[PDB]
Amino acid sequence: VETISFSFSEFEPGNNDLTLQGAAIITQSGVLQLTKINQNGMPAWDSTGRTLYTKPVHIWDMTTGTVASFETRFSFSIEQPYTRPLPADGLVFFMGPTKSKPAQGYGYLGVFNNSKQDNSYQTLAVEFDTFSNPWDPPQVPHIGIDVNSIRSIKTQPFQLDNGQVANVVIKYDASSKILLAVLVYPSSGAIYTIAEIVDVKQVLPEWVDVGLSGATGAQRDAAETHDVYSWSFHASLPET
């Protein structure tokens, strides 16, 4: 069996196991600010940032046909400071081709480049979407399972608890092909779930980079924070 795992109880500046891209920075306090926080302490619009684990993950093997099961957990907080304009745009956990650089921002969350479901993306992602674009369901925010497209194969509306910490658990079982995501707000006790069938060997390349990405809006003050406090990941590829 081939396994890989990491766990950051808090983010460590300078720890090379993580790569920061775009606007992403890690504070001395250990918080990953995916999108820029201005000097005044407020979230900047037109910002896109990501972080990738620096070691590629072997998600499946074409020769043996084996597929890995994996799990990832993280705690994040989104703070929407203004009543108007509408906040944006969201944050997301993604898995895709190695050596990737940030893609388009805004509604594409730094992961996609359009609203097409293109197999060439070879990307799987679980989004926490705060702005309703033309391809989105009207309810925001919502959790979404994205398979080679920003247009989610399934969505689940959830109520934001402004500025509070949400705990996320995402798990993929290769035998059942079930991808599940759960969001819990300790503050209110709210629990949300979403799941769908995803055959990773039909979507992802054999080796992938895993990461987190966040993006704020296309107009002044159409923004919110996209802070992450912790992040763990584990994958196991059976020999079979």
Ligand X SMILES: OC[C@H]1O[C@@H](O[C@H]2[C@H](O)[C@@H](O)[C@H](O)O[C@@H]2CO)[C@H](O)[C@@H](O)[C@H]1O
Using the minimum distance from each CB to ligand X, give the nearer residue, 108 or 233: 108
CB of 107 to Ca ion, least distance (A): 4
129 marked as binding residue? yes
Residue 63: which residues within 8 A CB-CB, separation 6 or more?
none
94-133 binders of ligand X (CB under 6 A): 106-107, 131, 133
Among 81, 85, 97, 163, binds ligand X (CB under 6 A): 85
**What would the DSSP string read from start to end of 208-231?**
EEEEEEEEE-SSTT-----EEEEE
Three-state secondary-structure class, residue 203 = helix
| Residue 193 contact partner, candidates Ca ion, Mn ion, its own copies, none, CB within 5 to 8 A by sort of partner | its own copies
CB of 9 to Ca ion, least distance (A): 30
158 marked as binding residue? no
The amino acid occupying position 66 is T
CA dihedral 153, 158, 162, 165 (to 10 degrees): -80
Tell which residue, 79, 192, 86, has the closest CA to residue 145.
192
| Residue 131 contact partner, candidates Ca ion, Mn ion, its own copies, none, CB within 5 to 8 A by sort of partner | Ca ion
Length of the chain in residues, anyone? Answer: 240
The amino acid occupying position 88 is A
Q: Which stretch binds Mn ion (CB under 5 A): 68-76, 117-125, 132-140, 162-170?
A: 132-140
Tell which residue, 83, 117, 124, 77, has the closest CA to residue 100.
124
Q: Which stretch binds Mn ion (CB under 5 A): 54-62, 136-144, 167-175, 209-217?
A: 136-144
- Based on the shown chain and the rule CB under 6 A, indicate whether residue 217 belongs to the binding site for ligand X: yes
61 marked as binding residue? no
Using the minimum distance from each CB to Mn ion, give the nearer residue, 22 or 144: 144
Q: Could you tell me the two tokens for 127?
A: 């989004």
φ, ψ at 106 (rounded to 5°): 55, -135
110-169 binders of Ca ion (CB under 5 A): 129, 131, 133, 136
| Residue 37 contact partner, candidates ligand X, Mn ion, Ca ion, none, CB within 5 to 8 A by sort of partner | none
Longest dimension (CA), the chain: 55
Q: Which residues bind Mn ion (CB under 5 A)?
A: 129, 136, 144
Numbered residues of the known binding site for Ca(2+)? 129, 131, 133, 136
